[PDB]
Amino acid sequence: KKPNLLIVFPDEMRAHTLGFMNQDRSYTPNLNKFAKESAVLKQAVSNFPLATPFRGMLMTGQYPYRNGIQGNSHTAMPGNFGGKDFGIELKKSTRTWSDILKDQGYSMGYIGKWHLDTPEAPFIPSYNNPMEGRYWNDWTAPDRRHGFDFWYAYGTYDKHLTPIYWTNETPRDQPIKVNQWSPEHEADIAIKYLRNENGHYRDRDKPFTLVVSMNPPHSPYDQVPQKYLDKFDGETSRSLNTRPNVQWDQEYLEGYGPEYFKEYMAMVHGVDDQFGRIIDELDRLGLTEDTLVVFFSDHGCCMGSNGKPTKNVHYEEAMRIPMMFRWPGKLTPRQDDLLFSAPDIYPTLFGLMGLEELIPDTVEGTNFAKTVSGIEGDTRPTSQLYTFMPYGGQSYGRRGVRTDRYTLMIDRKIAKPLTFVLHDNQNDPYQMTNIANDNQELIAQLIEKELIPWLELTGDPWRPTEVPASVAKAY
Amino acid sequence: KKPNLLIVFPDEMRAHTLGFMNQDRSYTPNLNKFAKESAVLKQAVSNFPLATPFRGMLMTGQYPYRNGIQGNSHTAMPGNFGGKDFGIELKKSTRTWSDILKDQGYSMGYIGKWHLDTPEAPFIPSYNNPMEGRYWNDWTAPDRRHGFDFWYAYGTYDKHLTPIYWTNETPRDQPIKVNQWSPEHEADIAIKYLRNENGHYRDRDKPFTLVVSMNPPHSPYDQVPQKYLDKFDGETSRSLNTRPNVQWDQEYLEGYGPEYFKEYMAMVHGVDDQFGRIIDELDRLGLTEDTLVVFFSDHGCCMGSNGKPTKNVHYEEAMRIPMMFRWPGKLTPRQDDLLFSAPDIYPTLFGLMGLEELIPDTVEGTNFAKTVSGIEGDTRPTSQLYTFMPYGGQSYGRRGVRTDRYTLMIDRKIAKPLTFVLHDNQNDPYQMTNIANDNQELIAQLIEKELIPWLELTGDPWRPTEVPASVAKAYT
Ligand SMILES: [Ca+2]
Ligand SMILES: [Ca+2]
């Protein structure tokens, strides 16, 4: 009766990698089939396209300004700065949707990358503890798992072929060290959770929520199984990465950029294979009709498009994420260009499951269960907020809006003119031209109709005005 | 049957000015009598002791970080910075307690100083439009009055003897220009609201909320009726301002500081008189038992105590505010030392009125209606948050905690060691000594047990750590 919830989301998988989207030269047969059984939001975005900010929005239904999860949740070495110096973490006292489902009588499981805690001293052994001025990895202590009674997760760790996990059984100092591609290992654990063979993964009498947060197709690109690379045998990153806005002649940081596109596509194929294993097991078990399945990613990846290596930019390749909802017998398959945003996920899931009344007032996103279900009545957004927040600078950085036609981005520094970037996504679908100059009137309307209303709705203090050097005098 | 709500609050009146407190040498007979009939919260504070931040907390029950009302709501001149550059204003889409009460079927009236909107161009004529690089005054348009269907109010305007107001009947370009001390004029309007002769002010069949927001004893100090000054004939500012921590030889901005203490006491006395007039009319009309009456202020005023002229500091004279609830037949008179905070006002009032189920999840303050009613069982706070937020610097500035014994304040700047100020308020009642250096372990305990939990509760990203100069390179 009470519905189950299965959430699968890989990391850094742009919507363009979905084969049925007719964009990237990719091979995702399992997700293609899933899409034709699902209600697909084809215009969904990650408003702050960065892992930790997105997970903040997923767990809280709030935008970054009020949830405080405004960057990476890392911890500085002495003389440096990191997320911990600005409260960037999911707080123990925060009531997430996973807390609420737990109190509704659910068994709750989380598999994979958590990426929401700041590491604490003494820091655990880890190749990234420290790395580039910061400590990055730690377990999640049991009192910080927000209702997930089954745990099989880590903080941040990118060695895809040798992942490490903490579980109900592990103490902090002895995690499970795995020799297996992490998506496959995570699919294996998901299968066992779904089967619940010994009865100790979850309660037989309760509904369940399982989250599987895969790391690939996130970098690095040298930890991909040969099996999945073999799917693109004979092709190269050049022959595969054909998007017109790719800048091959830009200089990229070692290990990143369009020359790794073949590896990216192979990881996408690999994740598609493992997603298929999980869904096939769900259906083999007879759980298809009682389980709402949702697939998305935390942000996209530019892979050289417009000269950007990965994410954390306003471009379509970083903002656009998959978003699909499958529930055969209760959701009719469809596609919709709803301007969906990351804080809408939480309340929309609650709406779909019949739990609208449990959405607290603190949620800033919108319940679009009606639109997903093909039912009239939602107010359709005219824009999606874009944001980049520099550490400690909530009143500065980049803000922008994405409408059904334009992407506008504004950068704000102290004592400098505002920089404007404007794309006509209709005439310029690959966002290769900035038309901000001599579009003052259109930009003014976008600011007045879209950006300011989002900023006021979220409490964000950023405003599109210059400020003199004296404003920083005080601090 | 549904209770009325009368809120009266003057500006910049520290708790120490109440005669029954046995602190300042003040004459407040009407407030002394009101106190003997009320539930009095003797330790209430304004956590961000500045006008517009307090009003933000009053209307939203949220702390400043999440409500965004983090400074003065003024508008900069070209080349300057103001509140408007950082969203510092009540947003039209924000649902306040006044919006909620309106939907419950109340008549809602606001008299006096609003001080919650940024001025818009073209800027109305006003002595402070501009003043010191910013525009300060404007009306409040009908769609921004948040359920207050009777309006008699202004934005920011300190000419206490010639105030200006907008009402339902006034366009932006012709306000009402008054020649009368603002608290007296506002008491006049409030009495007319309560009488409601011929039904012009409110619906006789609805409960009402009336807010009277007075400006005195806020500066300036040369706009006081001579009548009120005459009460202190034979005294001087020197003879009245005897607090041991007053620093007479500090350098003060022209028109501020301890030499204006007589004027300050005279305004307090004047406001007490006018408060008495409003309460007497309410009781004469037989509304006493159906009306919850609340008196507070938005912040205190140091008046030279510890060398500070006015507010926006952690000292007791700036943080401590009056706070009294009268409702004869429902609230037994009492005195309580609860560590009450400004975001608690809204939910506590809803609690007292039987409206606790209407408090939204966004409210961060706590409903202490039981404590105010003398009923045991509330979780008593162990501290009150202090905050100073520089314009555009939500991660920096001063933060602190006030407990039943200590006040700790920490100031955080980019590429600087933290500065620590600690007062033992028990042994150093006037906070004249900073004992921070000899109490490193106590400070660690206060940060861990009090400050960090408040910061996490409020979402405030400020943390007590040094950050290097490089942190600002991304946005300078
Ligand atoms: Ca990510
Ligand atoms: Ca004030």
Residue numbers in the entry:
A (entry chain A): 46 to 520
B (entry chain B): 46 to 521
Paper text:
In this study, the crystal structure of endoVB4SF was obtained and refined at 1.95 Å resolution. EndoVB4SF adopts a globular conformation with two monomers per asymmetric unit. The refined structure revealed that each endoVB4SF monomer folded into α/β topology containing 12 β-strands (β1–β12) and 10 α-helices (α1–α10) organized into two domains. In the larger N-terminal domain (residues 20–420), the major 8-stranded β-sheets (β4, β3, β5, β1, β6, β7, β2, and β8) are sandwiched by α-helices α1, α4, α5, and α6 on one side and α-helices α2, α3, and α7 on the other side, forming the catalytic domain of the enzyme as observed in other sulfatases. In the smaller C-terminal domain (residues 421–521), four antiparallel β-strands (β9–β12) are flanked by two α-helices (α9 and α10) located on the solvent-exposed surface. The N- and C-terminal domains are closely integrated together through hydrophobic interactions to form an extensive positively charged groove, which may be important for the binding of the substrates. According to the endoVB4SF structure, the two molecules in the asymmetric unit form a dimer, primarily through interactions between the C-terminal domains. Size-exclusion chromatography analysis showed that the dimer-forming capacity of the endoVB4SF-C27A mutant was notably reduced compared to the wild-type enzyme, suggesting that the Cys27 residue is involved in forming endoVB4SF dimers through the formation of intermolecular disulfide bridges between the monomers. The active site of endoVB4SF is located in a pocket at the carboxyl end of the central parallel portion of the β sheets. The predominance of basic residues in the active site, such as Arg100, Lys158, His160, His263, His344, and Lys356, generates a positively charged surface to facilitate the binding of negatively charged CS/DS substrates.
